[PDB]
């Protein structure tokens, strides 16, 4: 994932 929170 390119970002946290996913």
């Amino acid at each position: 994932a390119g970002x946290a929170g996913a």
């Epitope: 994932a1 390119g2 970002x3 946290a4 929170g5 996913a6």
Partner: antibody, heavy 117, light 114 residues
């Protein structure tokens, strides 16, 4: 090209609330994560909160109790609301996909919010 | 709370000089990868120069370079130019699969000696 147009009132009274929005053009806000950041005059950048591409909002500790970040998928907008404002909250507010690890980064033009009676 | 500490807070350098700005994160960034460097010029919104620690975004002069690892990151301007006057900020992304945060360094003011 892609654009991220910011809007919302500039003058807000102490004890009141600010409401800022950003409207995307050329892409979809409901498919990316977007932050709200502010910068007091002459000071540094401060991260307020992040709304993931999945629609979950996470707030920096200082902002959690007064801030609400939402999005309108039909309008293709993201919105910040902060209540119980004080002079300390005067700042230029930006919406931004910060692009810390990705190639896609986009910032709104910035909007000065002045807290004064 | 997550913190990024830049140093120096300000510096004065002559044109052609080599400038180094460091940025220490209080904990590991997302995927040990999500750090970017921003440049803010007088009266302007911040402009991203670097992403993923060391990826130079297209159009940015190559005299700007990012490096580092773990929780220690560095911005380098190989040959300072007058148009490089600005405040420079590191910004990191942090969290887990169910938590996401960002933090800005306090900024480094780069002044041009002349």
């Amino acid at each position: 090209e892609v654009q991220l147009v910011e809007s919302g009132g500039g003058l807000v009274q102490p004890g009141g609330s600010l409401r800022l929005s950003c409207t995307a053009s050329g892409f979809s806000i409901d498919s990316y994560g977007f932050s709200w950041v502010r910068q007091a005059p002459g000071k540094g950048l401060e991260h307020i909160g992040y709304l993931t591409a999945g629609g979950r909002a996470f707030y920096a500790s200082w902002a959690k109790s007064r801030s609400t970040i939402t999005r309108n998928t039909n309008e293709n907008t993201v919105t910040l609301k902060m209540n119980s404002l004080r002079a300390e909250d005067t700042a230029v507010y930006y919406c931004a996909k910060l692009g810390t690890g990705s190639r896609f980064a986009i910032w709104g033009q910035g909007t000065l919010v002045t807290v004064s009676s | 709370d997550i913190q990024m500490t830049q140093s120096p807070s300000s510096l004065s350098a002559s044109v052609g000089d080599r400038v180094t700005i460091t940025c220490r994160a209080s904990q590991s960034v997302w995927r040990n990868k999500n750090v970017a460097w921003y440049q803010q010029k007088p009266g302007k919104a911040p402009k991203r120069l670097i992403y993923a620690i060391a990826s130079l975004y297209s159009g940015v002069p190559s005299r700007f370079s990012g490096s580092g690892s773990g929780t220690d990151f560095t911005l380098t301007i190989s040959s300072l130019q007058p148009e490089d006057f600005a405040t420079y900020y590191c910004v990191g992304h942090y969290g887990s699969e169910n938590d996401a945060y960002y933090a800005f360094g306090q900024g480094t003011k780069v002044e041009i000696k002349r």
